[PDB]
Amino acid sequence: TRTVSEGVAHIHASFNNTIVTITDRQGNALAWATSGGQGFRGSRKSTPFAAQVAAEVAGKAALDYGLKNLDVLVKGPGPGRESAVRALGAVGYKINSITDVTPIPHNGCRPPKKRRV
Amino acid sequence: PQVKLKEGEPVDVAIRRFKRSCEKAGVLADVRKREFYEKPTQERKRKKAAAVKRYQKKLARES
Amino acid sequence: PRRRVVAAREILPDPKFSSQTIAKFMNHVMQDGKKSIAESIVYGALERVQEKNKVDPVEFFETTLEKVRPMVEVVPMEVRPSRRTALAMRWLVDAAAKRSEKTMALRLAGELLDAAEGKGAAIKKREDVHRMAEAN
RNA sequence: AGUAUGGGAGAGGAUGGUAGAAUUCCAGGUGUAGCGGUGAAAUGCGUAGAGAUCUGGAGGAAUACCGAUGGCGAAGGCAGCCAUCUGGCCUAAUACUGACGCUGAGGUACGAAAGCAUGGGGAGCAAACAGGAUUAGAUACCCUGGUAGUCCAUGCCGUAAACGAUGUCUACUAGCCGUUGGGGCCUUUGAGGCUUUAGUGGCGCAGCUAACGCGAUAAGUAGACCGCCUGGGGAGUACGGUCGCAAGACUAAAACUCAAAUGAAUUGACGGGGGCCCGCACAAGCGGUGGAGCAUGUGGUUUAAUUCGAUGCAACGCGAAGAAC
RNA sequence: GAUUGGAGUCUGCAACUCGACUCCAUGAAGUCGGAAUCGCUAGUAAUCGCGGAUCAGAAUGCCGCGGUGAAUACGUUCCCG
RNA sequence: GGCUAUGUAGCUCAGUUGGUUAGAGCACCGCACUCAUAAUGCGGGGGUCACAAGUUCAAGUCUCGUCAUAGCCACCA
Ligand SMILES: NCCC[C@H](N)CC(=O)NCCC[C@H](N)CC(=O)NCCC[C@H](N)CC(=O)N[C@@H]1[C@H](O)[C@@H](OC(N)=O)[C@@H](CO)O[C@H]1NC1=N[C@@H]2C(=O)NC[C@@H](O)[C@H]2N1
């Protein structure tokens, strides 16, 4: 119902899953899709293809809200960031900027123990 | 990063300028380092090995 | 072959039309060394299409094979020119068998005639291939 | 050996304040089916609305980049920034005292982490513990949680592969290349080049060593003083004693038993160590087997006997190129 | 073209257990085969027939012979040695 | 007595008001993978969907009754 022209794309990429959230500016969410939603259960969540599918779904859903140019922010390591941002452009959006915003501590809290596998 | 994109820049080329920006920044290296806690003994050993390797590289490139 | 690169085999043109495309199509049709039966089938099909429409068999066969020829295969990948002709002949062979004419030569002539105007089962197979291809 | 005066570098120590990033929790806005986790899963969280995203609060702990084979400290150790109190070191030239030195049994001070006592604090992490996995079993490694503890104040404990496995002090013995803090000299406008000194590194002549290796930061050549060793186990154990709230620490045997236990280096073998290449090994193709009926061999079962061998690849149309007698 | 009923030939002292072949009758499963797995780089694979050793008789096995006669190899990631 | 809710393989949960044209997970047995094993992958077997009738072109799936069970309530010969 509400019409916005400019938007923000948030990509939450990890070694386990990829979450794509489309917001307007000021951070109010409009649409979201994840690799878990489009099948790809379990270990299949982390492949770049699943991230691409989720990004395509989220972009198509946001197109109903009807915005044409968006700014993407990538937060996190792992596969699917590049595939997801490519899929957003391939849907027909104009990307205005692309930057990394993963949080980095200035030596804050202690991380968990190292895995002995 | 803040990779702003020109009128004639394609989407793929913009993303490519992006991974170069982020690879130059090296944030993913910090993310890799942060995920598990490393003991001070292991950190000291790693830095000692790095210093030895750097000096060997300097000697090799000088002669 | 790891190190060695092997040259592609060169086959002789067919004795009748001196066409390596016809020779290779005959080789695809032939089973267990019955080149005589393969020749009978292929030459009967060409004679049938020639009497149906007064057009040079070589030109008709090459035009139809170009029409059926795929630029991509089937999960999309890319193919080389040789694979294009190989897959075109491969798909053209089966539909004639599933047709219902009394002889294989008549069946294959009918299949070629139907694929030339686009209402062929091989054409449908190519359509499946490319409507699969746009998936990626 | 020490004192006065000028100058310099430093995560040296103690007290207080303060800044930014991030994690967790709380409230709210958008919004809707998943999130999280693994080799794969599951336990767990979520339609009384999670995860994601934005704004605002609470609290604790630690200080990204700089960062360095760098620096400081007797050792243990010390890293955001600012102020206060405070120790040592380096460097120049004069002046001053005139052997005032070195080492050090007993003694005494400090002394990582864990642990203990009293009172606080508690974000994250995490012994014990609970559950889910894996496994023949799993008490573990993996996963989801989680208490002591890790933090502060005041005390105790006195041990570490507390290591350079190398006690402190002094003098002498080729050279070459780095780096940190200073002094001097020379070019000539500003940045370079020579030296000298105190640290910190890489090679290396002589010498030394069983060898590996050390080699002006000696494991070389000599001197002063202290500590320690005398085959492997029993054993840093027992009894006695000192200290400690306790855990325990320190001092420290014998009976008995074996003919070895060790260090360095050499050849081979092995590795669920690495690198390199080839092969119808995989890819690309064509045709088969596993399904049916029958032939033949084997296992098993049965039998009076179903004669004996061959058993992963490398046994199974194999010895047998031919059992009605 | 399995199985079964009936009738025969030959080898052999002797075809019940337990031979091969011929004729009449009968006419089973089977309509292309799951997970998986095998061979083959050219006169090869595939397909068609012919011969021999053993041997009185008893090959779909073994060892040979010729006829017709293909498809595909971009490459070394992956699997095996 | 009144109101409700259930009864599906060797063991369990679906399938729930029409054309249900009963499946899913563990038990097995056989096969495959392995140097040997698992897990896993494949195949086969293992119920006849509480019973009895009614409508209907469609009934485990709906309507009537008869069982077994569970929950709450009511019972002054
Ligand atoms: N005046 C007061 C000054 C005080 C200050 N301390 C200065 C000083 O006095 N120094 C004296 C030098 C003695 C040195 N500590 C002995 C030594 O160096 N090795 C011990 C002898 C073992 C053996 N015979 C040789 C050996 O195995 N070597 C290895 C080897 O080359 C290489 O290992 C591998 N896998 O290839 C390398 C990479 O790690 O490690 C070396 N090993 C090590 N390198 C380290 C190092 O130098 N130190 C600390 C420790 O970590 C050392 N171990």
Coordinates of C-alpha atoms (C1' of nucleotides) in Angstrom, one line a residue, chain E residues 34-37, chain F residues 31-32 41-42:
Chain E
rG34 C1' 15.9 -49.9 -7.8
rA35 C1' 20.0 -48.5 -4.7
rA36 C1' 24.3 -49.6 -7.2
rU37 C1' 27.9 -51.6 -10.5
Chain F
rC31 C1' 20.1 -56.0 -1.6
rA32 C1' 23.7 -52.1 -2.2
rG41 C1' 20.4 -45.5 0.1
rC42 C1' 16.9 -49.5 -2.4

